[PDB]
Amino acid sequence: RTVARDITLLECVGKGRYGEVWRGSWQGENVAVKIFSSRDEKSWFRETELYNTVMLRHENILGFIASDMTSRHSSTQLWLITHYHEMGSLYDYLQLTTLDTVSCLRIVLSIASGLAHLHIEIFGTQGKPAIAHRDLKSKNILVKKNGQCCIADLGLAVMHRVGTKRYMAPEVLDETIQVDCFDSYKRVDIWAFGLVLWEVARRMVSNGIVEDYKPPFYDVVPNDPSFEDMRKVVCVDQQRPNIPNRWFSDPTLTSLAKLMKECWYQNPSARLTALRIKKTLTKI
Ligand SMILES: COc1cc(-c2cncc(-c3ccc(C4CCN(C)CC4)cc3)c2C)cc(OC)c1OC
Ligand SMILES: COc1cc(-c2cncc(-c3ccc(C4CCN(C)CC4)cc3)c2C)cc(OC)c1OC
Ligand SMILES: COc1cc(-c2cncc(-c3ccc(C4CCN(C)CC4)cc3)c2C)cc(OC)c1OC
């Protein structure tokens, strides 16, 4: 038998500290190829150990194809291969596109479905450990053609500090997080989910009105904010993203505002669960 292992790299769709993502081809089929920098090599190891422990399969989790370590000439290449989503990140999609009730709710409910699946322990040989993502953000969510999203990048994921500073929960920023308690990392995911909810809601049209794309805390921190910039805003001043007046003239945005507030409590144990959010979004 021949093992057809030739992947053609076609175009780079992302470059960063993490390394690079490429649109690739494997046997006519579109694949996404992440090439890790030496700087991010631990993320390849952590994600490969996760998938070697539990082979995640969910419509709202980026679909795993392969982890490859190759010997280059003097160096080790680390590759992650996943399904390819031509529409790109939620971050990219929201920049140019506005949403209606249906497309807005489809997006946020699919993210909550994916996050609930990560979070839940399922018992049995066909089951899974509970997983906290710890790096949820709009760049780590991909849009599918059927209008649902999938959660990506399990490089920081933990099975039962780190992440993007702009999305870090206050207990992470002020280092009060109960590091030994697995529920702590679920609570950090809910915080970041609340912020993504905010980024999506802004782009949903109501009464002829929409806000432009902005990242969380765009009005109170610079680009590439420092730990200290984030700690002062989120922990010391306890600021939270603005809810515009126009959202209170729409039933959906009014419900989404309530949900994001219940993601943003300074007290982590006061925050909604992914499962409670999935239910509330299904009712909206
Ligand atoms: C090594 O590397 C890559 C390989 C492949 C790939 C290509 N053809 C066939 C295969 C294959 C899978 C599974 C079996 C089974 C058959 C039943 N038996 C009981 C156990 C073994 C055999 C063959 C693979 C794995 C794709 C890749 O990525 C898209 C690879 O990564 C570069
Ligand atoms: C990694 O990814 C892809 C792999 C393949 C692929 C290529 N050759 C053989 C296989 C295979 C055959 C059979 C078994 C089973 C069935 C029986 N059982 C008792 C033992 C094991 C497993 C694997 C696959 C899965 C195709 C793909 O897509 C067209 C892949 O994705 C891009
Ligand atoms: C976040 O994380 C990972 C993501 C992906 C991934 C999967 N599908 C599609 C993409 C993608 C395609 C295209 C654009 C843009 C670029 C050009 N512009 C004109 C609009 C489109 C953006 C994004 C990505 C980045 C793969 C990964 O690993 C293999 C990731 O890491 C786990």
* 3 exposure class (CB count in 10 Å sphere: 0-12, 13-18, 19+): exposed
Resolution limit, Å: 1.8
Any idea what DSSP says for residue 234? I
Nearest atom (ligand 2) to Cα of 31: 32
**CA-closest candidate to residue 205, choices 88, 90, 94:** 94
H/E run at residue 172? helix 170-173
Nearest CA to ligand 3 atom 7: 84
Q: How far apart are the first and last CA of the chain?
A: 53
Which among 36, 45, 62, 77 is the best mutation to test ligand 3's pocket, defined by most ligand atoms within 8 Å of the CB? 62
Q: Is 19 annotated as a binding residue?
A: yes
CA distance 188 to 173: 11
Q: b/e map of 245-267 (b: 16 or more CB within 10 Å)?
A: eebeebebbebbbebbebbbbee
**CA-closest candidate to residue 201, choices 118, 100, 123:** 100
- Residue ranges lining ligand 2, Cβ < 6 Å: 26-27, 29, 65-66
Cα–Cα distances in angstroms (integers) from residue 247 to residues 198, 239, 255, in the given order: 11, 19, 9
**Residues after which the chain has a gap (C–N > 2.5 Å):** 160
Domain boundaries, the chain: 1-86, 87-284
203 within 8 A of 98, measured Cβ to Cβ: yes
Cα 120 to middle of ligand 2, angstroms: 28
Residue 174 falls in the annotated catalytic set: no
